[PDB]
Amino acid sequence: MKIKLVRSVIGRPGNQVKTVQALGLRKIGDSREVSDTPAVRGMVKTVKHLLEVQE
RNA sequence: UCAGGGAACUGAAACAUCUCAGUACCUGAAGGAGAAGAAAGAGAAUUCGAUUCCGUUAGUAGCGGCGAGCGAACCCGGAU
RNA sequence: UGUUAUGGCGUGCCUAUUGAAGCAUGAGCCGGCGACUUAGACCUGACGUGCGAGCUUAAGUUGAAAAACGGAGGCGGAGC
RNA sequence: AACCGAACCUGGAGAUAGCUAGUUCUCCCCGAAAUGUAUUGAGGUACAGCCUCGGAUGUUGACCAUGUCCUGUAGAGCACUCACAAGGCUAAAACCUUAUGAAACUCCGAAGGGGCACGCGUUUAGUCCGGGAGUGAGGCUGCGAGAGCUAACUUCCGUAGCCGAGAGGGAAACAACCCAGACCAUCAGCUAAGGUCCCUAAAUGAUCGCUCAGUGGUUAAGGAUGUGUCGUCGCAUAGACAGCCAGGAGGUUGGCUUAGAAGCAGCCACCCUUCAAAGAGUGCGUAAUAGCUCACUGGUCGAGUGACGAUGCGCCGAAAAUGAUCGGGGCUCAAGUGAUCUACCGAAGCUAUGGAUUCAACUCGCGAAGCGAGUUGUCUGGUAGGGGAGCGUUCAGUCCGCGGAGAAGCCAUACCGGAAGGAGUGGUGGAGCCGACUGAAGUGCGGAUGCCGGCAUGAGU
RNA sequence: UCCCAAAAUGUAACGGAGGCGCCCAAAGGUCACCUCAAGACGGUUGGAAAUCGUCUGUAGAGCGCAAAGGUAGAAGGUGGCUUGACUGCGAGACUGACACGUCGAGCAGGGAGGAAACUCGGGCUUAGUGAACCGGUGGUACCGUGUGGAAGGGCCAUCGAUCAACGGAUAAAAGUUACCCCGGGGAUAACAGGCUGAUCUCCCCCGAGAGUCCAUAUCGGCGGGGAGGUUUGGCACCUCGAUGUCGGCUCGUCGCAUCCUGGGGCUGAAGAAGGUCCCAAGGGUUGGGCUGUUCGCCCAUUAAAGCGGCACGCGAGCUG
RNA sequence: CACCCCCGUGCCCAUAGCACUGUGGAACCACCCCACCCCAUGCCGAACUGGGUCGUGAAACACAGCAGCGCCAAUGAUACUCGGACCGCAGGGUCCCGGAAAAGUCGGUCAGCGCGGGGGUU
C-alpha cells in the first residue's frame, strides 16, 4: 500500500487522530510507502476515508 | 516609666470560652530615666547565690470549646 | 517624505463572560501621582559559592576613612 | 446645628470585606479547567483529575492486529411476571387454537465495548520522585436517554466534535455548522469546503430528462381529467366510449311500516313473464302521486375507451401588524432541478524561494560540562498558569571619558536592532553628563464612577 | 435494591418504584437426615383452600424483613452435640480524593462437631450505620516534675451521639423590619423584549346527525390536520454602576381573521328585511350614567357605533 | 478392545430427556423374608439397619426398538449495528462499507468416551 494524507485531522475523533499520528503523518499532503501487514492494513482501513490509498 | 480603671472591630471561615488584650483609650504619680533589687529565691548539682538588659535554651515544657490559637523557666554565653 | 482621489477589505479599548460592536461596566482630553512589598538566627525547594563527615556562629568585644575576636547555641551523626 | 430606627470629632483603624473594581516593559517554549468527592457547601474552600518546570527511568505510552475472557443494550421473543385481541371450551380461573405490548419481562441476543498477552507491526509517549500553578459558572451541534406538550437558543446525564483559549475560506450578515489549525517575508503555484449570468474570482459549460409554477426563493391533514414514467384490471371492427333519434317493460302503490311513503325516510328479499330489450332498481322531486333520466336494447359514425395502483416535478389548502425582496440585480431562448463528465476560481491548507526560532543527533573551538557558532531534521494558534532570554528608569561602587566653540531636558527626522528599545544630524537650552561591569530598587501604566493640576464640550447657549 | 445507565466499571434530575436505623441463642458452629408450589382423582366434622392418600412435579416454593442476583447434589426443611457471634496476626487483592469500607490463603495459642477428609475467627449475599473531642466501667502497671508512694495521666477492652440538615462550625440559641442600612447579582424573580405554544384566538379535513323530507341554506357529535402569536404560562437569553409600572388624556400609524359603507356566489333568496361564504381596508366608526379601571352593564342615538399590533404604542408629552 | 454381557465409578453433564413397546434372571441387581435386640422412622424397621432362602422379573433396574413430545438445530433473506455519507420542521428515515441476530424452515439425533471388579463363549 501507498499512503497520502488528503483530509484534515480536525473535527475528527481521537482514534483516527492517533492512527494518523502512528501511521506517521504530519500535514495533509504528506505520504509514505506502507507495509502490507495486518496491523498496518488496519492502520490504513481504520482511517481509510482520510487517506488516498494508492494501490 | 509605674500605677489605678480598661474596650470592641477582628480570629475562631457563624458563636457564647477563648482570641484581638490587658493592646487602644481615660486617670494618678515621677524622673532623666524609670521600674526592680540584696532570697521565707531559683534548681535537682546535697548547684547557683540581689535587680535589670541582649543571646540562647524553644516555639522545647506546658496551656487550649486540648479548637482557633497562646507559650515559659533552669542551665550556658554577654552588658553590667 | 507629506498630502490626496478611487478601489478592496474592515463590528472602538478594557472588564466581566457560555457568549461583547455591543442598547452590558468603566472612562471628557492631556500631564504628572498611582498597586504583589518589607520582616523575622522562621519552614520548604531550585540555582550558585565555601568548607566537607563534618558545617556554623548569636549576644557582645575590641578595632573601624577597614574587620578580626567571640562556640553559650544550632544542624549532620540511629532508629523504633 | 441644612440627610438620626441611634448626633458630631478624634482615636482602636491600612476593622473585616469568602464581594466588586484596578493590577503598569519585550520576544520565545508548553499550556489547562469549567469534572469527582466532601463541605452551614453550593459565584467560596480541601483532595484528586487536567498544566508546567527539574530530576529519574528510559520504552512500559499511541494506534492497529491476532488470541482469550467478561458484559446483555439494539434487535427479538413470549417459554416466566404484568398487561392484551378473535374463538373454543367449561358449572369465571388454568387448558387449547389464532393474536399481541413491555424502563423496571426474558427462551434468545449482535454491532460495539472492556480487561489481559504478544507484537508478527507503524508510532511516539508513559511512569516515579520533587518545586510552581490555575481551574471546581461552561456553550452549541450530532447520536443515546430521562425530565417537558418526541415545546423551548428548556433542563439533567452518556458520548464525539468544535467555541471557550482558534485567526483563514465558505454558509448575505452570523462562536459552535462545513473545509481547515495562522514561525516571519513574496504582485509566485496546486487544491478543500463552496462555487464559475452582472454586483465579486472561475464554463450563460456538455449530454439525456423534469416543472411553468416563479415552483426554485416560509408546513400539514386533505383536494384535484396539471404534466413525466412504470404496473392492474377492463371492456370491446365478428364495429364498443362519449354524443344523437327512439324505447323502457307487464305482476307490483313487490311484502313489510306507517297518518300515509307506490324503483328513491326505515325492515325483508330482489323472483316470475315477454323479449332485442327493459333491474322490484341510480338521483332529483311530492304530503304519497305523479313527472324527469339511468342500468338493458337498435340504427348513424368509425377510432379506441374506461377505472385503480405507484412514483418523479408541480397547484390549492398558505392571514399580522413601519416599506418591499431568492443577499440584489435578474433568471424558464434555466442564472431552476434529477443524473453524468470535464475545465477554472477558490484559505493564511499543500507547494516554491529566502530567513528566525524549538528540541534532537552530527563538528569543532576550549583544561573542564557549559556555552558559542556551523549542518541536517524537527518544531513554532493560543486564555488562566508554569519555564526561558532580554529592553528601560533611578540610586551606588569601579573603568573610560565628555562638556560654555556648550551637559541634562525639550523639539524634528526617510537610520539601526528580532522586541522592549538605540544612534546620527539639526533646532532649543544653559549647566552638569553618556557608555561598560557590578550592586540596590518608591523601577515601566489607558483603564480602578482612581488622585492632584491644567484645558476642552455643551456655546456664546 | 431495582429501572433510568446507552450489554465492563462509573454516570444527573424536586426522573420512575421500594425497603433499613432491625432481628436470631440460636434464624449460629458442626454432624446426620428430609425436600418444595401446585393441579387431578378419591376420601370424615370437612365441603372454597385447608387434614390424609395416590399420580403428575426444575421447583411454577422456600429463604426472618425491600428488591435483585443466587440456591434442591441446598443457602430450603428437622434433630445431636457446641462454642470460632475466639485471641495473637495477616501474604494478596477489590474500592475510595482522603478518611473509611470489603473479600481473604496461610501461621500460632487454645478449643467445637465429625469415624474421618475436613469444616469453624456469626447468620446466601448485598441495608440494620456515626470521626474526633469530653466522660463512664473492668483490666494493665508504661509516666508520675527531690526520692518512695499516692492523685492524676497512658495502654487494653468497653459503655454514652436521630450530632438523620446522618464527613457532624458551640457545652449552650427563635422571630420581625414597609424605619431600614452596606457589599454584590441580570449568576436568579416582578415589567417589556426573546425563544416556545400546553393554554388562548382563528382556519381546514370527516360527516353521525339536527334541518317536515334533504348531511353541507344554515348548524355539526366523535376524532383529526394547520395557522396566529394579541391570553395565562413554560424557559430565564440582554438589562439589577436603573429598559419607570396599571388606567386616562394627546398624538398617531399599521395588519386583517371587515363593524359600516362598495362588488359578488349560494340561501331553505317572492318583494321588503335577513343569513352565509368570496373579494375588498378608501374613508368612517357618536354623546352620556356607574367604576382608577382596562373590560362590562345600562341611557339616548347611529350606516356603523370592528378586532388586534406598534416596549399590553405614546410620563426627557401631561395626568397620577 | 479376543466376543459379550453384568456391577461399581468417571468424563460428559437433554442432538446424551420422556413416554409408548419388547428383551433379561436364578452370574450380577432388585423386589421378597424375618428381624428381640446393634442403629433407626417426630407414627410406621415403609426409610435408614441387622440376618437370609425360596419365588419372581411383575415393580425398580439394564438393554434394545421407536422419534408422538421434548432438546439440538442449518442455509437463504431479514432485524439491528462499528465506520463512512446524507435526508425530513419534527415523529422518523436513507445510501455505501464491514459485522451480523433472534424466531422460523432444512435437517439432526433417544449419545459418545474411560477406569476397575464379576460372570460367561459345554
Ligand SMILES: [Mg+2]
Ligand atoms: Mg453590572
Ligand SMILES: [Mg+2]
Ligand atoms: Mg479600609
Ligand SMILES: [Mg+2]
Ligand atoms: Mg404529520
Ligand SMILES: [Mg+2]
Ligand atoms: Mg486615566
Ligand SMILES: [Mg+2]
Ligand atoms: Mg412591574
Ligand SMILES: [Mg+2]
Ligand atoms: Mg417576561
Ligand SMILES: [Mg+2]
Ligand atoms: Mg353585501
Ligand SMILES: [Mg+2]
Ligand atoms: Mg418616553
Ligand SMILES: [Mg+2]
Ligand atoms: Mg430453539
Ligand SMILES: [Mg+2]
Ligand atoms: Mg467499516
Ligand SMILES: [Mg+2]
Ligand atoms: Mg452510521
Ligand SMILES: [Mg+2]
Ligand atoms: Mg449491510
